């Protein structure tokens, strides 16, 4: 029953999918306006321990 909570949490991870819609659309945005400088992507480090 509590695991059901995991499912909506997964949806939050799925919403992480949506940004790559935003990124691809935004990144594509710069048509030949010859004055642009890019903006670019990141990935993060992590670590988690238990008792």
């Amino acid at each position: 029953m509590g695991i059901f909570g995991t499912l909506y949490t997964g949806v939050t991870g799925l919403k992480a999918s949506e940004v790559q819609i935003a990124t691809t659309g935004n990144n594509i945005s710069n048509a030949n306006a010859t004055f642009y400088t890019r903006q670019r992507v990141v990935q993060t480090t992590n670590g988690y321990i238990t008792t």
Binding site: N26, S29, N30, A31, N32, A33, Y36, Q39
Partner: protein, 51 residues
């Protein structure tokens, strides 16, 4: 979002080159050549008229 968007591409409102004054050099030059050549055309022509 978390980053501002300079949105893509657009066109500029149309205009003509900075300077004409060079063209002014010709406008003045015209008048004087317009003098000499016209004066010439008449004068030598006349010079043959009455030899």
């Amino acid at each position: 979002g978390g980053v501002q968007v300079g949105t893509g591409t657009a066109v500029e409102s149309i205009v003509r080159l900075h300077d004409e004054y060079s063209y002014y050099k010709l406008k003045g030059a015209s008048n004087q050549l317009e003098y000499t050549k016209y004066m010439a055309s008449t004068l030598q022509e006349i010079a043959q008229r009455f030899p």
